[PDB]
């Protein structure tokens, strides 16, 4: 059986706090 | 005289609408600002 | 019912809101 992963699986790459940016 | 004055007034009044409606009207000055900002941002990101 | 997928080296563009929460991402490739 197979399925679409859609846009899942994103985690926080580091412990850094970033505010209202694109990284 | 009256017709010329009315034409000038109408054109001057349409200047405001032409500038305000069009977002790309002042692209040259914004391009200067964006070039300065991009150069500074490149200089900053070169520190990484 | 459990689902399994595999990680790969990739570049992602993640958006952080003002609260530091990742609210969206772009898979560049």
């Amino acid at each position: 059986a197979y399925t679409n992963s859609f846009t899942r699986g994103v985690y926080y790459p580091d412990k850094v706090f970033r505010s209202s940016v694109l990284h | 005289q009256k017709l010329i004055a009315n034409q000038f007034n109408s054109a001057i009044g349409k200047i405001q609408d032409s500038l305000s409606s069009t977002p790309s009207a002042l692209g040259k000055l914004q391009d200067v600002v964006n070039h300065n900002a991009q150069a500074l941002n490149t200089l900053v990101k070169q520190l990484s | 019912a459990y689902y399994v997928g595999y990680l790969q080296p990739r570049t992602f563009l993640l958006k952080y809101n003002e609260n530091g929460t990742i609210t969206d991402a772009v898979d560049c490739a």
Binding site: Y12, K15, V16, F17, R18, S19, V21 | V44, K45, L47, S48 | E18, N19, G20, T21
Partner: protein, 48 residues
Amino acid sequence: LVKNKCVNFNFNGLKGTGVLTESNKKFLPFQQFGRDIADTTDAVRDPQ
């Protein structure tokens, strides 16, 4: 913890110099230190 004064500091290994003034901010429980747009650490969390 020396607050409101220009000091040298070392938080867990994050070494730096500046003035600490208790920012409000909203750090996620796991987030140790913050960063500005220029990738310079503008906030930290006290490990005590």
